[PDB]
């Protein structure tokens, strides 16, 4: 099968900033 798009992981950035600072 085909992989999903790299862009389908974009929301991890928001998750990251939930738990960690810049």
């Amino acid at each position, epitope marked *: 099968p085909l*992989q*999903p*798009e*790299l*862009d*389908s*992981f*974009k929301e*991890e*950035l*928001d*998750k*990251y*900033f939930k*738990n*960690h*600072t*810049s």
Partner: antibody, heavy 114, light 109 residues
Framework: EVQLLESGGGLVQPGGSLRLSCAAS????????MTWARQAPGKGLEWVSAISGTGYTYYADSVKGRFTVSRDNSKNTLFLQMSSLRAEDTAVYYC????????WGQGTTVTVSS | SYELTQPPSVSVSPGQTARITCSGDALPKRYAYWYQQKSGQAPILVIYEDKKRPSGIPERLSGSKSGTVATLTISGAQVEDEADYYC???????????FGGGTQLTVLG
């Protein structure tokens, strides 16, 4: 404290191989895409590769077929296996978190030369 | 290969507003991201998802996107803002990411 510790860079002859490593701590590593980027001396940033937590892999056209990205979630480590190295692969190589690099490693220098 | 187009150089007077553009055919459907790199340093993310500001980044820095053009706006420019700024996004397929060529910001005076 989030830490990305890179290793594995060095001088390699063209056609040689190198394995870069990025040991992560301070976050749930298996929850995140990890990204490789690079910067040649005096040039711009270039996206190299990315791997999702569950192992989906993505590659720049300039390295596809020569580089393999991998990860070990149990050891919180990201790898870039480089093969068929060319002069144009000379660069500082960075690992970073998520598909849009948010926290960057400090880099490891790869020099491809005879 | 999908590419993002940035001007190589932008200059701004102290206290004025710098606008750095980044054009690409997939930008109407793909988020833009912006990085700041000062000489001899690793890059820092300054804008994500067109317009979101990471905590700690100055409010003077903002991002916007319209059509095929994303813009990083730096208002009240200070000498400390001199750096190379790179936009970053993904292609129409969504399977590759790419940086723009970078824009060197010069603060005049």
């Amino acid at each position: 404290e989030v830490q990305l510790l890179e290793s594995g860079g060095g001088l390699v002859q063209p056609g040689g191989s190198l394995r870069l490593s990025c040991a992560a701590s301070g976050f749930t590593f298996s929850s995140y895409v990890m990204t490789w980027a690079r910067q040649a001396p005096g040039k711009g940033l270039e996206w190299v590769s990315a791997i999702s937590g569950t192992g989906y892999t993505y590659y720049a056209d300039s390295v596809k077929g020569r580089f393999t990205v991998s990860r070990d979630n149990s050891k919180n480590t990201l790898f870039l296996q480089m093969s068929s190295l060319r002069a144009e692969d000379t660069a500082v190589y960075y690992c970073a978190i998520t598909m849009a690099p948010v926290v960057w490693g400090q880099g490891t220098t790869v020099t491809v030369s005879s | 290969s999908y590419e993002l187009t940035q001007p190589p150089s932008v200059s701004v007077s102290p206290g004025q507003t710098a606008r750095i553009t980044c054009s690409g055919d997939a930008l109407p459907k793909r988020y833009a991201y912006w990085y700041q790199q000062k000489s001899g340093q690793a890059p820092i993310l300054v804008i994500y998802e067109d317009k979101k500001r990471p905590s700690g980044i100055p409010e003077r820095l903002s991002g916007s996107k319209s059509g095929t053009v994303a813009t990083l706006t730096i208002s009240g420019a200070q000498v400390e803002d001199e750096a190379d700024y790179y936009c970053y996004s993904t292609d129409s397929s969504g399977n590759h990411a790419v940086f723009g060529g970078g824009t060197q910001l010069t603060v005049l005076g």
